[PDB]
């Protein structure tokens, strides 16, 4: 089936500048127009603008035409998004779609992109153990910027999965907890681990949760 | 750029309600509107196009309408896996502008949250602080209180509570509150206690531990 994935989302400097990268998979990306979407944390969706399949024609929404310059690899079957001189408004998920029939049939999970004068923070990972349903879970303490994922067990636990929204601590930066229901029976005879992964940082943990 | 407008920006429903979304636009853009549905955490997925026109896998439930300026969205019956921001959007003139998005929330019965207290890792004991954590799983309405117990008496500290959204299963919400001490203050006291006051509890539940137990 069609997938996008967008890479390189991260910690930019007001006036900074960083590429964006879609990989897709599925399809003839050649055949296809290509476009990216932002959506500020807890906000609406804007449109930022569309490449055709030979590069000939490329449209932006014009508020953000200095912001951005949309380019592909048809060889690569990658879509690129540049960003120029960010500003704090800027801070955005950045979602690439594939537009078909004037619709956006298939989009990308997205990247977050946050413009800030802070500096990058990987994560601390600690086990939340136990002692008929039981909890355990991780706690993934002070990072900067968001986000971090967590799975389960490399993605075979999805069941009971909770996975908090950050806080910003006093500190200035992010924590979360990631938290799993299990059988308590299962306590003694399941191996659990979660899953860290924070792109910014480039930091992969895995934590064995024992109780 | 062609505003479009949704209304209302905001409802709660039950399971099995019929509910209707309205989109507007600055302009006449004939039969050129989508509709998307944004669920939690997700990805905005294409819902109906061209006005009506349901797209490849949408249940039979989801249906749209209109012309010109005016457009609706309608769920025939509400299903809990409806829970989402729905959002409208022009395809008519560039650039495509969307709407500002419809949040849908259900409501459901009340349930009471299921209880979980986790005492600080020996791992993060190691680096100075201790973040104790109480877990409220699975409960309906949102409206909860957690009280930290420090040796049966209320303490002060710094506690921070997230919430997650409703689920798309059982519309519930989970909630966790985490107390963060430093070490040295983590070992002036020995029951760390969480009591939880919700609606489905009758009266309130604490959840325990012995520091070092
Ligand atoms: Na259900």
């Known amino acids: 089936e069609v997938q996008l994935v967008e890479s390189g989302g991260g910690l930019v400097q007001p006036g900074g500048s960083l590429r964006l990268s879609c990989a897709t998979s599925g399809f003839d990306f050649s055949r296809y127009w290509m476009s990216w979407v932002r959506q500020a944390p807890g906000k609406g969706l804007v449109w930022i603008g569309e490449?055709?399949?030979?590069?000939?024609?490329?449209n932006y929404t014009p508020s953000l035409k200095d912001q951005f310059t949309i380019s592909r690899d048809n060889a690569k079957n990658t879509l690129y998004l540049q960003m120029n001189s960010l500003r704090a408004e800027d801070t955005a998920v950045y979602y690439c779609?594939?537009?078909?029939?004037?619709?956006?049939?298939?989009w990308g999970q997205g990247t977050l992109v946050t413009v800030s004068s802070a500096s990058t923070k990987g994560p601390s990972v600690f086990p939340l153990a136990p002692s008929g349903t039981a909890a355990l879970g991780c706690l993934v303490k002070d990072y900067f910027p968001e986000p971090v994922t967590v799975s389960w067990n490399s993605g075979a636990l999805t069941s009971g999965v909770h996975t908090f929204p950050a806080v910003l601590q006093s500190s200035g930066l992010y924590s979360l907890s990631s938290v799993v229901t299990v059988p308590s029976s299962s306590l003694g005879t399941q191996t659990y681990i979660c899953n860290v992964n924070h792109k910014p940082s480039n930091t992969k943990v895995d934590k064995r949760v024992e109780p | 750029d062609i505003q479009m407008t949704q209304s209302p920006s905001s409802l709660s429903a039950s399971v099995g309600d019929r509910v209707t979304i309205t989109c507007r636009a600055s302009?006449?853009?004939?039969?050129?509107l989508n509709w998307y549905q944004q669920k939690p955490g997700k990805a905005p997925k294409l819902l109906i196009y061209y006005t009506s026109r349901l797209h490849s896998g949408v249940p039979s439930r989801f249906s749209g309408s209109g012309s010109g300026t005016d457009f609706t969205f309608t769920i025939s019956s509400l299903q809990p896996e409806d829970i989402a921001t729905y959002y409208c959007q022009q395809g008519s003139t560039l650039p495509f502008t969307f709407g500002q998005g419809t949040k849908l929330e259900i409501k459901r019965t009340v349930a009471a949250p299921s209880v979980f207290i986790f005492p600080p890792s020996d791992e993060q004991l190691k680096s100075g602080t201790a973040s104790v954590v109480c877990l409220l799983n699975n409960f309906y309405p949102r409206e909860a209180k957690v009280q930290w117990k420090v040796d049966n008496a209320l303490q002060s500290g710094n506690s921070q509570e997230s919430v997650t959204e409703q689920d798309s299963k059982d519309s519930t919400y989970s909630l966790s509150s985490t107390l963060t001490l430093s070490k040295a203050d983590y070992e002036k006291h020995k029951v760390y206690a969480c009591e939880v006051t919700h609606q489905g509890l009758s009266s309130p539940v604490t959840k325990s531990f012995n520091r070092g137990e």
């Open positions: 779609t594939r537009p078909n029939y004037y619709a956006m049939d298939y």
């Open positions: 302009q006449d853009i004939n039969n050129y």
């Open positions: 490449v055709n399949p030979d590069s000939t024609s490329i």
